[PDB]
Amino acid sequence: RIKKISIEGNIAAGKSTFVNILKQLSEDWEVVPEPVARWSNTMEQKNGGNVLQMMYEKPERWSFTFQTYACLSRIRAQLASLNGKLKDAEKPVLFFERSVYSDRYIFASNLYESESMNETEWTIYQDWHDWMNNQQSLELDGIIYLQATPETCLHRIYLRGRNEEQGIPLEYLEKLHYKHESWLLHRTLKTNFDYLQEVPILTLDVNEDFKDKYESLVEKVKEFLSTL
């Protein structure tokens, strides 16, 4: 039975970096990169790049369209890996770059909060999400929270160098940080997914650069996985 682990964290915390480290360390370990992340570098990539660029121009027009396609794209990619990969593995683990929960409780929620979605768009989105999900095989065995300060993440957006992201303000990162702390550290965040309240969470501090020095982080991952 494939273990499903979500890697969660703020923008430019180092999730893609970490996930690309993990995938190389075991034949039993596979990754589902986040669709939105792939659109930031096929018909979905063409759709995704258009909707991302339009979002940057007019978030209040495109937020509902972007969020629905981002989440659909994620479910399709996660289900494809779950059904396609790790069939011969001894201790199969599939690492998701973020989850359907971060789609809704971090990003979509923040866009609603910024009035980039109106109430009808936000209620349709949650109804769609509740339905699109409660049809199942994507429920998580655990979450790994890559915890970085907003300033770390701001600095890492500058390091990564995507033109469209250089205007992202610290205040946005602080807002998303607060949301991640409520959800994954304090577990104050109420979701519509009862099992998430009890899902094990491994929090890793990634303020220190780990690209050349990640063995301690991986050791904590291997320990966490053995507990599941």
Next chain:
Amino acid sequence: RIKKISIEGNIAAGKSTFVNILKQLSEDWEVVPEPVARWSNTMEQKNGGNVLQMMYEKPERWSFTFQTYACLSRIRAQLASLNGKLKDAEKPVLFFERSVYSDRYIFASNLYESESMNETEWTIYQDWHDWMNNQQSLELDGIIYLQATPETCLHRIYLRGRNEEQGIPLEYLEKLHYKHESWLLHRTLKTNFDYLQEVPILTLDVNEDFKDKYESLVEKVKEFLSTL
């Protein structure tokens, strides 16, 4: 095994009228009214009435949002009936008021054609539709096409008396009529659903009022059903 039959036809052809006749004639016969039709008279009804009113104001803003929610609402309602009803029936038949195919090939397609959706919205919508569907138990055993002239349908919009519909122009009805003829009479319409090319279709002329005189129509339904 429940037989799934779609009732298809132009606006105000008499589908709701016909379906409400059928449901009363047999304990083995159930109906799934069309969500949009219910929104034209719960959280989905609240969402639906808002998005319908916004569509009437600004179709080029709301077409993608409306079409996705209308189709999701339809799938949810059709799956609920399929899983809930006709469990003790001898010859169970579930009559759908329209289908996921009319959502996409009649309405959404026409909104794309009117530039009420841009290419990205239309390509996201078709991707979503292709995916949302190709996950199955809703495939049709047959279609009943209630064929009325545009003028019949225009006259019936006036009879029904919904304020927001009284401005619907004949040209709109002619466009949707042409689409229904291509799909269900000529079968010139190419879809992404191979089985539809071979699905049996019963075409009923409903230009003559049938509310008090429908026995001949029902006889044709019972004959058609016996062939499936």
